[PDB]
Design a protein around this ligand. Structure first.
Ligand SMILES: CC(=O)N[C@@H]1[C@@H](O)[C@H](O)[C@@H](CO[C@@H]2O[C@H](CO[C@@H]3O[C@H](CO[C@@H]4O[C@H](CO[C@@H]5O[C@H](CO)[C@@H](O)[C@H](O)[C@H]5NC(C)=O)[C@@H](O)[C@H](O)[C@H]4NC(C)=O)[C@@H](O)[C@H](O)[C@H]3NC(C)=O)[C@@H](O)[C@H](O)[C@H]2NC(C)=O)O[C@H]1O
Lengths: 213, 217
């Protein structure tokens, strides 16, 4: 019955502090834990060990803005001067007798980040792809925040809904989101229209890029 | 510096056995427990098991009947074998350095060094390598379209790794065919579209595909 209980989410504002809680099961309430951080798209990294007396020891190179503490069965991770890079899933983990177990993870959202408009690049099919008897329009969407856009495709002004595939947005190195949308055509379709357009809508603002054969 | 590096096939057919290795450099494996951990796409971390070569091994009770963990001191290496794999075993697999046990029986609990992770996909679909096409038209964007491959991942570099600033490789789209496609773009000076040559280098390890593509306007 060794269980580490974490709330699935937490949130706090830029520059402020946040306290994350891990609760040990009652049969194991005196156990030490470790905190691990997993930033989006990355592997986990160790932050610190928190002992039953409330003392903690940070991993090599982990800054002092991360601290830990103990009250009863609860173990805490405190993060001060929150930055966008602290958006991550935080996992507590412990050492049982012959077993290790992880909590379910807490996803930390850092509020108050500035709005950022997407940058959009639209590419036509390459000659080499046309030589493979395919045609793909590639609409790449970067650097936006918050992380939601919608995409609409047009050919000579008319909506195009067949052949469209679009990814979900995901967080990037620069703390902004990215997505991409693909429009599959035949070579004949591509060559028959005067132009195709990718229209990206973000927070009520629509930008448009166009390509022509 | 102690470093951990997982490796294994990225594709496993259902009901067959997944074999992974954790190669440790910069220090010896002796005295520590070494743990295996996994994470299904978009889910939490799950401990698989651990090994201390000269003391004990054990594994998650949910997985114990299928888990074999061992070590090879001559290679400074840990191994995981997971038999009769299912879709639930699609995950990124990690190794990590765990508790140290001293000769006397005392020990120091730890979980302080993680490996990079290796991605494993369980699927009956055969591996398929990508077709790669150039993407071309202040700054300018050039890119490479990496089409119709399976399973994830592919890596993309530019100019053999000499170009890293302004390189953005986008997350893959998964098509109704069951195949992936992604794009990689480099942002460059407009003036340099004559001062420079741009080549994307695409690696798809499961199909042993390595191709280079020139991207020019
Ligand atoms: C067949 C098979 O696989 N058998 C395995 C066998 O291999 C394995 O060895 C055993 C034991 O497995 C280990 O289990 C422990 C946790 O056990 C619980 O320990 C609780 C105490 O917490 C630990 O205290 C240690 C000492 O702390 C120091 O005490 C001083 C005196 O009071 C004090 O002055 C210091 O300040 C204390 N130091 C600190 C830092 O606080 C400490 O070193 C450990 O880190 C502590 N562990 C944890 C998790 O906090 C005790 O109250 C419980 O009764 C124990 N529970 C049980 C069920 O025994 C793990 O720490 C260790 O990692 C395990 N080792 C392995 C190899 O898994 O299990 C068999 O099943």
């Amino acid at each position: 019955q060794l269980v580490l209980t974490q709330s699935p989410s937490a949130s706090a504002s830029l520059g402020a502090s946040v306290k994350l809680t891990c609760t040990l099961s009652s049969g194991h309430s005196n156990y030490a834990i470790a905190w691990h951080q997993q930033q989006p798209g990355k592997g986990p990294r160790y932050l610190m060990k928190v002992n039953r007396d409330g003392s903690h020891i940070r991993g090599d190179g982990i800054p002092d803005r991360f601290s830990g503490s103990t009250s009863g069965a609860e173990r805490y991770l405190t993060i001060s001067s929150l930055q966008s890079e602290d958006e991550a899933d935080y996992y507590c983990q412990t050492w049982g007798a012959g077993i290790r177990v992880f909590g379910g993870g807490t996803k930390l959202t850092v509020l108050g980040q500035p709005k950022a408009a997407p940058s959009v690049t639209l590419f036509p099919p390459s000659s080499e792809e046309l030589q493979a008897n395919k045609a793909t329009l590639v609409c790449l969407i970067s650097d936006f925040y918050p992380g939601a856009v919608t995409v609409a495709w047009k050919a000579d002004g008319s909506p195009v809904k067949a052949g469209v595939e679009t990814t979900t947005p995901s967080k990037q190195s620069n703390n902004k989101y990215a997505a991409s949308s693909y429009l599959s055509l035949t070579p004949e379709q591509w060559k028959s229209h005067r132009s195709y357009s990718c229209q990206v809508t973000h927070e009520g603002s629509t930008v448009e890029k166009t390509v022509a054969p | 510096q102690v470093q951990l590096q997982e490796s294994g096939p990225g594709l496993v057919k259902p009901s067959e056995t997944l074999s992974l290795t954790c190669t440790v450099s910069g220090g010896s494996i002796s005295g520590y427990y070494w743990s295996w951990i996994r994470q299904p796409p978009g889910k939490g971390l799950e401990w698989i098991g651990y090994i201390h070569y000269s003391r004990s091994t054990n594994s998650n009770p949910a997985l114990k009947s299928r888990v074999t963990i061992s070590s090879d001191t001559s290679k400074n290496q840990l191994s995981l074998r997971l038999s009769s794999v299912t879709a639930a075993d699609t995950a990124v697999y990690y190794c990590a350095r765990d508790t140290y046990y001293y000769d006397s029986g005392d020990y120091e609990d730890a979980f302080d060094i993680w490996g990079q992770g290796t991605m494993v996909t369980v699927s009956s679909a055969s591996t398929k390598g990508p077709s790669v096409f150039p993407l071309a038209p202040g700054t300018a964007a050039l890119g490479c379209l990496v089409k119709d491959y399976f399973p994830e991942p592919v890596t993309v570099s530019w100019n053999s790794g000499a170009l890293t600033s302004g390189v953005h490789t986008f997350p893959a789209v998964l098509q109704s065919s069951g195949l992936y496609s992604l794009s990689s773009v480099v942002t460059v000076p407009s003036s340099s579209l004559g001062t420079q040559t741009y080549i994307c280098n695409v690696n798809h390890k499961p199909s042993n595909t390595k191709v280079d593509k020139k991207a020019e306007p």
